[PDB]
Amino acid sequence: ADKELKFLVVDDFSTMRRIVRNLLKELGFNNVEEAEDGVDALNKLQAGGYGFVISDWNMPNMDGLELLKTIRADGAMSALPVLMVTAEAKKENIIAAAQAGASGYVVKPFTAATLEEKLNKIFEKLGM
Amino acid sequence: ADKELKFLVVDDFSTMRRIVRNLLKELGFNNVEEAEDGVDALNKLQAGGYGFVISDWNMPNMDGLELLKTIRADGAMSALPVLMVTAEAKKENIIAAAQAGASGYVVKPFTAATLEEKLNKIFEKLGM
Amino acid sequence: SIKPADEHSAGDIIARIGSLTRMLRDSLRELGLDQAIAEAAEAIPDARDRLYYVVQMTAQAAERALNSVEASQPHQDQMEKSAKALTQRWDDWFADPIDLADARELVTDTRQFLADVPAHTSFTNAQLLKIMMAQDFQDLTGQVIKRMMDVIQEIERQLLMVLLSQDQVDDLLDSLG
Amino acid sequence: SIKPADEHSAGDIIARIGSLTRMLRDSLRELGLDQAIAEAAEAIPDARDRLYYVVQMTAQAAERALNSVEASQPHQDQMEKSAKALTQRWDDWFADPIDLADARELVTDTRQFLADVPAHTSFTNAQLLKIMMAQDFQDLTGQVIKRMMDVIQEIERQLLMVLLSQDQVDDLLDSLG
Ligand code: BEF
Ligand code: BEF
Ligand SMILES: [Mg+2]
């Protein structure tokens, strides 16, 4: 994928946004921005430029599933890739986010190997 | 001090025994042993060889103050140096351990600089 | 023991505690707070797992890195004494009587060092990923304190009413999709 | 709404809750458990500090090291490309037409590298002490879960009765001694 691709890492825990930032830095993606919740995330997606989003599920103000359906329902961001990186593991929630239009799903704790594995599986089906 | 000096690091938390082991390794003392409580500590002091003890206060089976008075009261270990490294900070406990016959007192969290500072202040007054 | 007389017997006091006992048992039993104080008392058996979880993750992600720092120091060490070893060798060749022989052996040995640096430098740089990655425990250990603080809040109002893998996740999405 | 008649009014039901209410208020008030359920409800205001403490230490000792790993990578990086830079320069001098000039400049530049290694290697080895030392939070964050689990145990039996610096430490020891 184009190394200038703009990413939006959304999660309520600092520890976890920084751990994903670095992981992306190792992969060559240095144009990354942070968000602490669904709302703040949409606020930045409003500014424009983003082409890839990695989000968590459990977050205040507007959870991940709400942010997923919001992007999938907005006419100007509907196809924006969205990779889920959360702690939820109930087949019922995996499905739920799956049907909501999730690009990919990564359960925490995850390996650096697993993130790259699902970041590419997403670039593969979207011919990015 | 003689670099072969045998140390006995006593504390109920692994994290904290390993952090003191290393700190002593940087200072050149590689003859160090661990203990998880007052009793197990006395069990090793029974085996013989020890010339320096660093202990915590709050521990199961036999706390630090109990281990301090036990060594100070035993005829064969009475003068054994005992440096306290604990989390207790109430002037009332500092005094208590002080009157019990504590060689030194270090409050957690402590700096590597502080440990060496009080390890030498102990070797100084005992002409070690 | 002479004054007075009609004084409560040991039984009469106990007899009374019993009345207040049944009275209690039944105000709760009827107002349905026999319920409440039982949803909070059976939450304790759980929160003890969540607080013993946070200590699991803690004693792990704390021994993990402590293990990297453990294995990264040897390489920073070795790689540094060698650079210092050679910096010396050279200063001498260049100060002592010319000896073309030693001049060769010195070039050979530093081209070797130059070759080993990567092995050490990489490894050490791979342990820093261990230390990083491995710390994820905060976010995790953090959301459990998130929840376990919400529980300690119910157990609070319940005494206020009464007193005022990643391989399976793909087997799923891929087997149903 | 025709059958029957002598049926409890809205007031009569409320009237009754009140009786069970006072009855409750008073069984507790007399058996002295008005006390108990009040020592446990006022423990909650505390444990929320201890669980917000464990998250302080967590978000710290987790950003601390994450900061070392942050600053140690640049040096493992630089020190490694240079060794690789020179290993190349040399392979070429030794394969290409002899050029005594370059032979000098190559020796000068690697004796330089040999000199910088320590600066990097040390620093990186000093950050590993940051990462180590800094982790002390487990023992600490651990003893608070030690205590906070003992408290959640009382709050349990209280619903079982009802339902069955280092600069100051020296100013001290040295000013009184
Ligand atoms: F907070 Be995420 F759902 F792990
Ligand atoms: F457990 Be020790 F008293 F810090
Ligand atoms: Mg979250």
Ligand SMILES: [Mg+2]
């Ligand atoms: Mg302790």
